[PDB]
């Protein structure tokens, strides 16, 4: 974990002592106090629970039970029972009648055709209620306590030993605009897509409240009428199409435990911890200097940023000075807060959002600093 500096906590003349820390996933923040064991606090999981279904989108349809009806000129329109039943796709047209096809005169005869629509493979779409975004914080000594938080319920308080009663006021900060997005499910797999990207799909859809498949003509073809007959074809599968279009969109891993919870990879939680009156200990870290190197090179994140992993040899516990410049001054944005390494020969993550175009990421100071080239469009 990573201990808090002095400015990160404040002890009052009266009342209690408050801590302020922005905790991010896969990392941990520890708080120390004289004559007391350490308090380790971490953000374990940020999840979504059963987001409401909005619209299914059929990408593979199957036609069944075919019926065609005929009317000779001046005998009116052709009517099937299946025109009323919503299960069936129906077309109305007119055919070339005459002698060869047993009518009474020459001209266009009304012909109607219906077939039962059955959706073989569909794509579900879910809305995310942001006031329901769950996040879980674990806090243990060195006697564990697990704290289930909601986006709405940001204030959760917990009993302890020595530290007494704590009260945590926490806010959630999402990695991606969930009001411009959909959670999309296709069989075993799922992704985060644009709302508009789905709303602009040319496939048949069915609202979350159920109902009939709409605009069935996207996957059904009614070939030109003949004498008294029409060939109807269900179009081919379109899985390859969606799957190819679903590439440029990050996937969302399913849960191993509950298997109905969606885990967000990014995002962070900002916390204010109300504590009893007690004196903590502020570890003041030193900006790293000596040998560092890339465990994992800077690589794209699929949402406009880039993540790297570095290791330190000589630097003890030390802050890592990450900056992205065009010698000059940086123009980028350091995503990762407290980029600090606890133990030598230990790997650490650094995320960053560079300026669009060509820029250089610089990590560390002096000879032993690291430099990486980066382009962004």
């Amino acid at each position, epitope marked *: 974990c990573i201990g808090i500096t002095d400015r990160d906590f404040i002890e009052g003349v009266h009342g209690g002592t408050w801590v302020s820390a922005t905790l991010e996933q896969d990392k941990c923040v520890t708080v120390m106090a004289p004559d007391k064991p350490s308090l380790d606090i971490s953000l374990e999981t940020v999840a979504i629970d059963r987001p409401a279904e909005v619209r299914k989108v059929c990408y593979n349809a199957v036609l069944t*039970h*075919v019926k065609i009806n*005929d009317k000779c000129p001046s005998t009116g329109e052709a009517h099937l029972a299946e025109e009323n039943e919503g*299960d069936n796709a129906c077309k109305r047209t007119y055919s070339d009648r005459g002698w060869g096809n*047993g009518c009474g005169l020459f001209g266009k005869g009304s012909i109607v055709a219906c077939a039962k629509f059955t959706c073989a493979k569909s794509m579900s779409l879910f809305e995310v209620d942001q006031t329901k975004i769950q996040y879980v914080i674990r806090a243990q000594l060195h006697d564990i306590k697990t704290l289930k938080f909601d986006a709405l319920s940001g204030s959760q308080e917990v009993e302890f030993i020595g530290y007494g009663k704590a009260t945590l006021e926490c806010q959630v900060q999402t990695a991606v605009d969930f009001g411009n997005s959909y959670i999309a499910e296709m069989e075993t797999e799922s992704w985060i897509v644009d709302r508009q990207w789905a709303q602009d799909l040319t496939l048949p859809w069915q609202s979350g409240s159920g109902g009939v498949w709409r605009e069935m003509h996207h996957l059904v073809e009614f070939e030109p009428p*003949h*004498a008294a007959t029409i*060939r109807v074809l269900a179009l081919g599968n379109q899985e390859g199409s969606l799957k190819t279009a679903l590439t440029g969109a990050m996937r969302v891993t399913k849960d191993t435990n509950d298997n109905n919870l969606y885990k967000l990879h990014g995002g962070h939680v900002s916390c204010r911890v109300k504590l009893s009156a007690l004196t903590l200990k502020g570890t003041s870290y030193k900006i790293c200097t000596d040998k560092m190197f890339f465990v994992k090179n800077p690589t794209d994140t699929g949402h406009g940023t880039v993540v790297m992993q570095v290791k330190v040899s000589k630097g003890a516990p030390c802050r890592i000075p990450v900056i992205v410049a065009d010698a000059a001054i940086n123009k980028g944005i350091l995503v990762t807060v407290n980029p600090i390494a606890s133990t030598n020969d230990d790997e650490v993550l650094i995320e960053v959002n560079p300026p669009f175009g060509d820029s250089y990421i610089i990590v560390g100071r002096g000879d032993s600093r690291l430099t990486y080239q980066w382009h962004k469009e």
Partner: antibody, heavy 120, light 106 residues
């Protein structure tokens, strides 16, 4: 909407001829096979035979010798002719359509039926 | 070609999973249809092509079979279903009916 209705004389003297007429309403008699069936009260159904528009008819082997079925595409009413008739023929006579999709191989049926005529 | 049904008579209760059998004089593939006629009216088509169903038939009804033997089934018997049931043959030419199993209340 498609419906079938048969008619004629509901009372005939033995060893004579028979003239039933199945009029087809709400549909074109260009398609399908146009079929007749009978049912002697107390007993079940026996398939009599069918006729295409083109005129390729086909009858039940036990009766063909005494049966003619004509097809008028004009007035849209296919008709049944049973000569040398006896009291065994006294029954209910349904005119029904078989089916033909052809362009799709969705085939099998006897779809629309008439109420049937009681012939003696 | 001749069709034979078994039973010809049945006494069942509203809810019974009833099963009527129908066998042909030879192999006719999957070509077989069932019919439901209540006394007075004209026969009404229920099943077509062995197992496929016609729009207008309750889902309790279910047929199966290919080749030589075919069966009907009503999952949970219902009032209107008390009727006489027939079967059909294809030949590629000349068709044939069955004797008809009369369904009757217990």
């Amino acid at each position: 909407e498609v419906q079938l209705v048969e008619s004629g004389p509901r009372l005939v003297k033995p060893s004579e001829t028979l003239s039933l007429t199945c009029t087809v309403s709400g549909g074109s008699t260009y398609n399908h096979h146009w079929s007749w069936i009978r049912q002697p009260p107390g007993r079940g159904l026996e398939w009599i035979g069918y006729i295409s528009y083109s005129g390729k008819s086909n009858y039940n082997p036990s009766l063909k010798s005494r049966v003619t079925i004509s097809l008028e595409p004009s007035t849209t009413q296919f008709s049944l002719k049973l000569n040398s008739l006896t009291a065994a023929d006294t029954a209910v006579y349904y005119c029904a359509r078989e089916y033909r999709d052809d362009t799709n191989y969705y085939y099998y049926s006897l779809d629309v039926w008439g109420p049937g005529t009681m012939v003696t | 070609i001749v069709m034979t049904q078994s039973p010809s008579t049945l006494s069942a209760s509203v809810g019974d999973r009833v099963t009527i059998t129908c066998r042909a004089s030879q192999s006719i593939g999957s070509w077989l249809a069932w019919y439901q006629q209540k006394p007075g009216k004209a026969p009404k088509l229920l099943i077509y092509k062995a197992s496929s169903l016609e729009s207008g038939v309750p889902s309790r009804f279910s047929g199966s079979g290919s080749g030589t033997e075919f069966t009907l089934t009503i999952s949970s018997l219902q009032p209107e279903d008390f009727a006489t049931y027939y079967c059909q043959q294809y030949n590629n030419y000349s068709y044939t009916f069955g004797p008809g199993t009369k369904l009757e209340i217990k």
